[PDB]
Write a protein that binds this ligand. Structure first.
Ligand SMILES: NCc1ccc(C(F)(F)F)cc1
Ligand SMILES: NCc1ccc(C(F)(F)F)cc1
Length: 330
């Protein structure tokens, strides 16, 4: 079997992408943030503290004829940005673009951090990292991808994110019309539970390509590109007036500047990120200082190929027994 769903940016900056997901019987449609950096499927629900819900669509297990409470199970998650949420666990039927999984763990949020409350457009997350990272206790639960793998024509899903435009998540097949040239595959380490790989180097603008290994994770759930301080300093040195701002928390640049492209290596291939993808607009309404889409990973501990990098490519997440990541230009 296969599945295919359109994913849409939530705002004019591509801060996140939401994808409709059907849960329960009859279907309750929620718009979830597909996150290859985490492994929990959790939703705003009728059980969420009322003051902590501000416009989100909620899942109501009591109205689903296939929902079953998973007795004794709880979950609690903290994301790398300080976000957190927690609650209890149901199993229910979950469908993504025609692809159906029965008995999927649906984690019902009882408490959510403020950053989720303020995001009215995101009804929850759908984790797509490896199931070793799932936070359900005392019985760990499988992700939607792991549960569907057996039924898929091919144990893959692909991410085709748009620049200020809708895109596509496909499960079970590779759309050979959606990219140009060839797909370059590279090895993945699952030792930390992430889609972790090694980039072979980078270039700034039309500059010389620097061969150097950059280990990092492919994370659809992270907006920006986080790279080592040496690489990020080399990029922003090519932008007149750019500087790192402690009060803002990253590199800013004059909104009048033109940004150079950024190239990253995948084996012998090159993915080019156009400079316009790196502009995240004014730091405050009316400001002439703009926020950069490439930031240092020094304070994080790991390099993150977030949406800024991924939306420049067609990305294959190959969940075969030896997992690999594929990248193609588009
Ligand atoms: N998108 C999920 C996510 C968020 C943060 C991290 C960090 F910070 F631990 F790298 C990993 C994965
Ligand atoms: N990396 C996971 C993640 C994804 C989205 C959000 C947001 F946008 F809701 F704050 C927080 C954390």
């Amino acid at each position: 079997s296969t599945g295919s769903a359109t994913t849409t940016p939530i705002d004019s900056l591509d801060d996140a992408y939401i994808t409709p997901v059907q849960i329960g019987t009859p279907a309750q449609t929620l718009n979830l943030d597909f996150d290859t950096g985490s492994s929990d499927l959790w939703v705003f629900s009728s059980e969420t503290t009322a003051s902590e819900v501000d416009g989100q669509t909620i899942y109501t297990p009591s109205k689903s004829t296939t929902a079953k409470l998973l007795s004794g199970a709880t979950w609690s998650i903290s994301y790398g940005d300080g976000s957190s949420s927690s609650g209890d666990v149901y199993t229910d039927t979950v469908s993504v673009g025609g692809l159906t999984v029965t008995g999927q763990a649906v984690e019902s949020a009882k408490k959510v951090s403020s950053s989720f409350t303020e995001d009215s457009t995101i009804d929850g997350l759908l984790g797509l990292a490896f199931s070793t990272l799932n936070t359900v206790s005392p019985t760990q639960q499988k992700t939607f991808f792991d549960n569907a793998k057996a039924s898929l024509d091919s144990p893959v899903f692909t991410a085709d994110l748009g620049y200020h435009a809708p895109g596509t998540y496909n499960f079970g097949f590779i759309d050979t019309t959606a990219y140009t040239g060839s797909i370059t595959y590279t090895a993945v380490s699952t030792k930390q539970g992430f889609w972790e790989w090694t980039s072979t180097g980078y270039a700034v603008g039309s500059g010389t390509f620097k061969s150097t290994s950059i280990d990092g994770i492919a994370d659809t759930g992270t907006t920006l590109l986080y790279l080592p301080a040496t690489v990020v300093s080399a990029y922003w040195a090519q932008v007149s007036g750019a500087k790192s701002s402690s009060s803002v928390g990253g590199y800013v640049f004059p909104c009048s500047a033109t940004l150079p492209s950024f190239t990253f290596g995948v084996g012998s291939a090159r993915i080019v990120i156009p400079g316009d993808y790196i502009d995240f607009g004014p730091i405050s309404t009316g400001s002439s200082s703009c926020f950069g889409g490439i930031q240092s990973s020094a304070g994080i501990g790991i390099n993150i190929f977030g949406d800024v990098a991924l939306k420049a490519a067609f990305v294959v997440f190959n969940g075969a027994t030896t997992p690999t990541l594929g990248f193609a230009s588009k």
